[PDB]
Design a protein around this ligand. Structure first.
Ligand SMILES: O=C(NCCN1CCOCC1)c1ccc(-c2nccc3ccccc23)cc1
Ligand SMILES: O=C(NCCN1CCOCC1)c1ccc(-c2nccc3ccccc23)cc1
Ligand SMILES: N[C@@H](CCC(=O)N[C@@H](CS(=O)O)C(=O)NCC(=O)O)C(=O)O
Ligand SMILES: N[C@@H](CCC(=O)N[C@@H](CS(=O)O)C(=O)NCC(=O)O)C(=O)O
Ligand SMILES: [Mg+2]
Lengths: 194, 195
């Protein structure tokens, strides 16, 4: 099928979809914008993915759709549940940040609270969850591992010492970044802050 | 057929979608409604509820759990594409409901008022538009997105009674969900809580 991804010029919520296309070697149009386009969207939000003239929305709904019946999905139905659960736990936390807050003091207080109080607890929980295992779910890479690497990359921009106590979580990031298709995308993609 | 123990507070909240699914599929489960929380919280991999214990193995994330329980059932969506549509509608609803500062007074009251007055009507319009005159939100039969629509809108109605005054078709969909026999049976029997 013809795939057209529409999002801002940034990694953000589209990047999980971009990793998935890269890994599965699926050609797509990576359409990066830039008030007018917002009025055309089903729920006024991006990313959207057009699939042969059908408009899909919700980054994780799309990500899950693209990984159905592929090696990035969980190998069992319970593994798929763990994959979904880890992704929503990550998405929940990232969604707490006031990305679009215009008041700079309010934004700084909230980012700081989340990074200094909430984030370390989540890192601890993820590290204990991973234990000594190779990937987050099962015996091979899933799109949960991709999403960990994507979210932690952005968190590290704001809190460089985030993973100083979690070398196993750093090792996982590096393993995702070492996957040939992912490594190639990381080196060729537009360099944006977020 | 596994042993299911659902752990949550004594309320509909985020556990209710799971309770609807168990009801519709006629699955026996322990509805564990919890002073007890500090101890229980300390045993959970991610410290949040709901969790679902499946033969003693702890699953978390209400929608991950709901999706798991609906796999290979008539609630999932009839194709891979419909399954995407179902997931997208559920996340759009969850996104909005998760904006509310449930655990935050004054600032809490202000944010509720803003969300309900300024944002909710926009979302209702978009949902009505998406429904597009059809009987159900995705495809030709009920999915767990319809269940979630009914659950989320029930709670929004507690705070904003006029939520659907401009959307008769959304009221009709709620009533259709509420009339599904297993759902109707659960609605009449469940503990009565505000939220
Ligand atoms: O900066 C973000 N959004 C504002 C977009 N803008 C475009 C340019 O002009 C106006 C501002 C933003 C959004 C999303 C995320 C993000 N990244 C990775 C993962 C995420 C997961 C959930 C929620 C947000 C996530 C990070 C930053
Ligand atoms: O009030 C809520 N949660 C705090 C419950 N408490 C624990 C300690 O005892 C008293 C207070 C709450 C949480 C969740 C929802 C909720 N309902 C339906 C759907 C929802 C979807 C997303 C997020 C929240 C949702 C509504 C209310
Ligand atoms: N859970 C959904 C949220 C999308 C979203 O809110 N996107 C932002 C843009 S950016 O913060 O990713 C959005 O659409 N904001 C409103 C706007 O910019 O008009 C998803 O993952 O697709
Ligand atoms: N996206 C997740 C959110 C779970 C959550 O934050 N749960 C709250 C309770 S609330 O639903 O009444 C929670 O467990 N908070 C931590 C606490 O209360 O200590 C889900 O849907 O399962
Ligand atoms: Mg979510």
């Amino acid at each position: 099928p013809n795939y057209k991804l529409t999002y801002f010029n940034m990694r953000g919520r589209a990047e999980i979809i971009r990793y998935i296309f890269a890994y599965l070697d699926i050609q797509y149009e990576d359409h990066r914008i830039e008030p007018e386009i917002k009025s055309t969207l089903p729920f006024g939000k991006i990313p959207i993915l057009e699939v042969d003239g059908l408009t899909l929305h919700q980054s994780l709904a799309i990500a899950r759709y693209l990984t159905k019946n592929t090696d990035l999905a969980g190998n069992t139905e319970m593994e798929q549940c763990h994959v979904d659960a880890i992704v929503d736990t990550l998405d929940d936390f990232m969604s707490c940040f006031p990305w679009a807050e215009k008041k700079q003091d309010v934004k700084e207080q909230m980012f700081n609270e989340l990074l200094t109080y909430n984030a370390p607890h989540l890192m601890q929980d993820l590290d204990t969850y991973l234990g000594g295992r190779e990937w987050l779910i099962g015996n091979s890479v899933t799109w949960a591992d991709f999403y960990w690497e994507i979210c932690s990359t952005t968190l590290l921009v704001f809190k460089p010492d985030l993973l100083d106590n979690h070398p196993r979580l750093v090792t996982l990031r590096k393993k995702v970044q070492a996957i040939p298709a992912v490594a190639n995308w990381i080196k060729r993609r537009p360099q944006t802050k977020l």
